[PDB]
Structure 1
Amino acid sequence: SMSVKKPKRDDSKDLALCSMILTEMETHEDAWPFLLPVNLKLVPGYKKVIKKPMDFSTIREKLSSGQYPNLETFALDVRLVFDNCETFNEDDSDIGRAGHNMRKYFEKKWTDTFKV
Protein backbone atom coordinates (compact mmCIF):
# COMPACT_ATOMS: atom_id res chain seq x y z
CA SER A 1 0.00 0.00 0.00
CA MET A 2 0.89 3.71 0.29
CA SER A 3 4.54 3.88 1.43
CA VAL A 4 4.57 0.10 1.94
CA LYS A 5 6.39 -1.17 -1.08
CA LYS A 6 7.35 -4.73 -1.78
CA PRO A 7 10.89 -5.13 -3.00
CA LYS A 8 10.44 -6.50 -6.49
CA ARG A 9 12.15 -7.57 -9.71
CA ASP A 10 14.70 -5.72 -11.74
CA ASP A 11 12.61 -5.23 -14.89
CA SER A 12 15.28 -3.50 -16.96
CA LYS A 13 16.00 -6.65 -19.01
CA ASP A 14 12.40 -7.70 -19.48
CA LEU A 15 11.82 -6.01 -22.85
CA ALA A 16 14.94 -7.66 -24.30
CA LEU A 17 14.09 -11.08 -22.88
CA CYS A 18 10.50 -10.93 -24.16
CA SER A 19 11.81 -10.04 -27.62
CA MET A 20 14.17 -13.02 -27.57
CA ILE A 21 11.47 -15.47 -26.43
CA LEU A 22 9.27 -14.06 -29.21
CA THR A 23 12.10 -14.49 -31.71
CA GLU A 24 12.33 -18.12 -30.66
CA MET A 25 8.54 -18.43 -31.10
CA GLU A 26 8.73 -16.89 -34.58
CA THR A 27 11.53 -19.28 -35.62
CA HIS A 28 9.85 -22.47 -34.36
CA GLU A 29 8.92 -24.69 -37.29
CA ASP A 30 5.28 -24.91 -36.08
CA ALA A 31 5.05 -21.10 -35.97
CA TRP A 32 3.48 -20.78 -39.41
CA PRO A 33 -0.19 -20.64 -38.44
CA PHE A 34 0.57 -17.80 -36.04
CA LEU A 35 3.10 -15.54 -37.77
CA LEU A 36 0.50 -13.30 -39.47
CA PRO A 37 -3.05 -12.04 -38.72
CA VAL A 38 -5.76 -14.48 -39.78
CA ASN A 39 -7.27 -13.05 -42.96
CA LEU A 40 -10.74 -11.90 -41.86
CA LYS A 41 -11.87 -11.71 -45.48
CA LEU A 42 -10.82 -15.26 -46.42
CA VAL A 43 -11.59 -17.34 -43.33
CA PRO A 44 -15.34 -17.62 -42.76
CA GLY A 45 -16.38 -17.39 -39.12
CA TYR A 46 -13.22 -15.92 -37.65
CA LYS A 47 -14.30 -12.31 -37.24
CA LYS A 48 -17.67 -13.16 -35.74
CA VAL A 49 -16.34 -15.98 -33.54
CA ILE A 50 -12.92 -14.64 -32.42
CA LYS A 51 -13.41 -11.39 -30.56
CA LYS A 52 -9.72 -10.61 -30.00
CA PRO A 53 -7.52 -11.85 -32.87
CA MET A 54 -3.79 -11.99 -32.13
CA ASP A 55 -0.61 -13.18 -33.87
CA PHE A 56 3.18 -13.03 -33.52
CA SER A 57 3.68 -10.13 -35.95
CA THR A 58 1.13 -8.03 -34.07
CA ILE A 59 2.77 -9.06 -30.77
CA ARG A 60 6.16 -8.05 -32.23
CA GLU A 61 4.77 -4.67 -33.32
CA LYS A 62 3.26 -3.94 -29.90
CA LEU A 63 6.50 -4.96 -28.16
CA SER A 64 8.71 -2.74 -30.36
CA SER A 65 6.38 0.25 -29.84
CA GLY A 66 5.98 0.18 -26.05
CA GLN A 67 2.42 -1.06 -26.02
CA TYR A 68 3.06 -3.66 -23.31
CA PRO A 69 3.13 -2.06 -19.83
CA ASN A 70 4.81 -5.15 -18.34
CA LEU A 71 5.52 -8.89 -18.68
CA GLU A 72 2.12 -10.17 -17.79
CA THR A 73 0.44 -8.16 -20.56
CA PHE A 74 2.90 -9.62 -23.08
CA ALA A 75 2.24 -13.19 -21.87
CA LEU A 76 -1.50 -12.49 -22.07
CA ASP A 77 -1.24 -11.68 -25.79
CA VAL A 78 0.87 -14.80 -26.41
CA ARG A 79 -1.62 -17.09 -24.62
CA LEU A 80 -4.49 -15.29 -26.40
CA VAL A 81 -2.88 -16.54 -29.62
CA PHE A 82 -3.18 -20.22 -28.59
CA ASP A 83 -6.58 -19.74 -26.94
CA ASN A 84 -7.94 -18.37 -30.19
CA CYS A 85 -6.40 -21.40 -31.88
CA GLU A 86 -8.17 -23.80 -29.55
CA THR A 87 -11.47 -22.01 -30.03
CA PHE A 88 -11.40 -22.29 -33.83
CA ASN A 89 -9.46 -25.51 -34.47
CA GLU A 90 -9.97 -29.19 -33.66
CA ASP A 91 -7.18 -30.54 -31.44
CA ASP A 92 -6.83 -33.33 -34.02
CA SER A 93 -5.63 -31.16 -36.91
CA ASP A 94 -2.33 -29.65 -38.09
CA ILE A 95 -3.11 -26.15 -36.81
CA GLY A 96 -4.65 -27.57 -33.64
CA ARG A 97 -1.53 -29.56 -32.81
CA ALA A 98 0.66 -26.55 -33.71
CA GLY A 99 -1.11 -24.51 -31.05
CA HIS A 100 -0.62 -27.06 -28.28
CA ASN A 101 3.03 -27.52 -29.31
CA MET A 102 3.64 -23.72 -29.46
CA ARG A 103 1.89 -23.07 -26.16
CA LYS A 104 3.98 -25.69 -24.36
CA TYR A 105 7.12 -24.32 -26.00
CA PHE A 106 6.22 -20.81 -24.75
CA GLU A 107 5.32 -21.66 -21.14
CA LYS A 108 8.59 -23.56 -20.78
CA LYS A 109 10.64 -20.54 -21.85
CA TRP A 110 8.45 -18.25 -19.80
CA THR A 111 9.25 -20.22 -16.63
CA ASP A 112 12.95 -20.75 -17.44
CA THR A 113 13.45 -17.06 -18.15
CA PHE A 114 11.51 -15.26 -15.42
CA LYS A 115 10.05 -17.55 -12.78
CA VAL A 116 13.36 -17.83 -10.93
Structure 2
Amino acid sequence: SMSVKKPKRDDSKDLALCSMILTEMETHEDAWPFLLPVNLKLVPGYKKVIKKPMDFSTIREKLSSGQYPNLETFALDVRLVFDNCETFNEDDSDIGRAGHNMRKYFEKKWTDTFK
Protein backbone atom coordinates (compact mmCIF):
# COMPACT_ATOMS: atom_id res chain seq x y z
CA SER A 1 0.00 0.00 0.00
CA MET A 2 1.17 3.61 0.19
CA SER A 3 4.92 3.62 1.10
CA VAL A 4 4.77 -0.22 1.82
CA LYS A 5 6.35 -2.28 -1.01
CA LYS A 6 6.93 -6.04 -1.45
CA PRO A 7 10.57 -6.79 -2.43
CA LYS A 8 11.69 -6.11 -6.10
CA ARG A 9 11.48 -9.34 -8.31
CA ASP A 10 14.17 -8.66 -11.00
CA ASP A 11 12.39 -8.10 -14.38
CA SER A 12 15.34 -6.66 -16.31
CA LYS A 13 15.89 -9.77 -18.46
CA ASP A 14 12.15 -10.41 -19.13
CA LEU A 15 12.21 -8.85 -22.67
CA ALA A 16 15.16 -10.99 -23.75
CA LEU A 17 13.80 -14.14 -22.26
CA CYS A 18 10.28 -13.63 -23.85
CA SER A 19 12.11 -13.03 -27.21
CA MET A 20 13.98 -16.39 -26.78
CA ILE A 21 10.80 -18.25 -25.94
CA LEU A 22 9.04 -16.71 -28.96
CA THR A 23 11.99 -17.75 -31.22
CA GLU A 24 11.65 -21.30 -29.96
CA MET A 25 7.90 -21.24 -30.70
CA GLU A 26 8.50 -19.72 -34.19
CA THR A 27 10.93 -22.52 -35.10
CA HIS A 28 8.88 -25.45 -33.79
CA GLU A 29 7.72 -27.74 -36.64
CA ASP A 30 4.13 -27.47 -35.54
CA ALA A 31 4.07 -23.62 -35.53
CA TRP A 32 2.85 -23.43 -39.17
CA PRO A 33 -0.82 -22.65 -38.36
CA PHE A 34 0.25 -19.77 -36.08
CA LEU A 35 3.01 -17.94 -37.90
CA LEU A 36 0.83 -15.36 -39.66
CA PRO A 37 -2.61 -13.87 -39.10
CA VAL A 38 -5.52 -15.93 -40.35
CA ASN A 39 -6.71 -14.47 -43.65
CA LEU A 40 -10.12 -13.09 -42.70
CA LYS A 41 -11.17 -12.66 -46.36
CA LEU A 42 -10.42 -16.30 -47.12
CA VAL A 43 -11.49 -18.26 -44.03
CA PRO A 44 -15.27 -18.39 -43.55
CA GLY A 45 -16.46 -17.95 -39.99
CA TYR A 46 -13.15 -16.60 -38.58
CA LYS A 47 -13.91 -12.98 -38.45
CA LYS A 48 -17.25 -13.33 -36.68
CA VAL A 49 -16.36 -16.14 -34.34
CA ILE A 50 -12.85 -15.16 -33.08
CA LYS A 51 -13.20 -11.83 -31.37
CA LYS A 52 -9.47 -11.30 -30.81
CA PRO A 53 -7.27 -12.89 -33.47
CA MET A 54 -3.65 -13.36 -32.50
CA ASP A 55 -0.61 -15.00 -34.15
CA PHE A 56 3.16 -15.27 -33.58
CA SER A 57 4.05 -12.51 -36.09
CA THR A 58 1.77 -10.10 -34.37
CA ILE A 59 3.24 -11.00 -30.97
CA ARG A 60 6.76 -10.54 -32.39
CA GLU A 61 5.91 -7.04 -33.71
CA LYS A 62 4.27 -6.10 -30.37
CA LEU A 63 7.34 -7.40 -28.46
CA SER A 64 9.75 -5.48 -30.75
CA SER A 65 7.85 -2.16 -30.39
CA GLY A 66 7.24 -1.92 -26.60
CA GLN A 67 3.62 -2.91 -26.68
CA TYR A 68 3.86 -5.46 -23.79
CA PRO A 69 3.94 -3.66 -20.44
CA ASN A 70 5.07 -6.81 -18.61
CA LEU A 71 5.80 -10.55 -19.12
CA GLU A 72 2.16 -11.49 -18.12
CA THR A 73 0.58 -9.49 -20.98
CA PHE A 74 3.01 -11.40 -23.31
CA ALA A 75 1.85 -14.77 -21.95
CA LEU A 76 -1.81 -13.70 -22.32
CA ASP A 77 -1.31 -13.13 -26.10
CA VAL A 78 0.56 -16.43 -26.53
CA ARG A 79 -2.32 -18.32 -24.73
CA LEU A 80 -4.87 -16.38 -26.89
CA VAL A 81 -3.28 -17.99 -29.96
CA PHE A 82 -4.02 -21.49 -28.59
CA ASP A 83 -7.39 -20.59 -27.10
CA ASN A 84 -8.48 -19.31 -30.50
CA CYS A 85 -7.18 -22.46 -32.16
CA GLU A 86 -9.26 -24.67 -29.80
CA THR A 87 -12.38 -22.51 -30.47
CA PHE A 88 -12.19 -22.98 -34.20
CA ASN A 89 -10.60 -26.36 -34.74
CA GLU A 90 -11.49 -29.89 -33.79
CA ASP A 91 -8.99 -31.60 -31.39
CA ASP A 92 -8.64 -34.43 -33.99
CA SER A 93 -7.45 -32.22 -36.89
CA ASP A 94 -3.88 -31.48 -37.79
CA ILE A 95 -4.29 -27.80 -36.71
CA GLY A 96 -6.13 -28.79 -33.52
CA ARG A 97 -3.33 -31.22 -32.51
CA ALA A 98 -0.70 -28.60 -33.47
CA GLY A 99 -2.25 -26.14 -31.05
CA HIS A 100 -2.33 -28.60 -28.17
CA ASN A 101 1.30 -29.52 -28.80
CA MET A 102 2.38 -25.89 -28.97
CA ARG A 103 0.50 -24.89 -25.80
CA LYS A 104 2.24 -27.74 -23.92
CA TYR A 105 5.60 -26.67 -25.36
CA PHE A 106 5.06 -23.04 -24.36
CA GLU A 107 3.87 -23.73 -20.85
CA LYS A 108 6.97 -25.84 -20.03
CA LYS A 109 9.33 -23.13 -21.37
CA TRP A 110 7.33 -20.56 -19.37
CA THR A 111 7.67 -22.51 -16.06
CA ASP A 112 11.30 -23.42 -16.66
CA THR A 113 12.30 -19.83 -17.48
CA PHE A 114 10.36 -17.83 -14.85
CA LYS A 115 8.81 -20.15 -12.09
TM-score by length of 1: 0.98
Using the aligned pairs only, state the percent identity.
100
Q: How far, CA to CA, are the matches of 2:81 and 2:50 in structure 1?
A: 11
For residues 57-98 of structure 1, the C-alpha deviation after alignment (integer angstroms, 9 at most, x for no partner) is 000000000000001000000000000000000000000000
In the TM superposition, residue 9 of structure 1 has moved relative to its aligned partner by: 1.3
| Residue 101 (structure 1) aligns with | 101
For residues 18-73 of structure 1, the C-alpha deviation after alignment (integer angstroms, 9 at most, x for no partner) is 00000000000000000000000000000000000000000000000000000100
Structure 1 vs Structure 2 CA RMSD:
0.4
In the TM superposition, residue 8 of structure 1 has moved relative to its aligned partner by: 2.9
| Gaps in structure 2 of 5+ consecutive residues | none
Q: How far, CA to CA, are the matches of 1:8 and 1:99 in structure 2?
A: 35
| Gaps in structure 1 of 5+ consecutive residues | none
- Greater mean deviation of Cα atoms: 83-92 or 5-14: 5-14
Q: How far, CA to CA, are the matches of 2:86 and 2:11 in structure 1?
A: 31
Q: How far, CA to CA, are the matches of 1:79 and 1:25 in structure 2?
A: 12
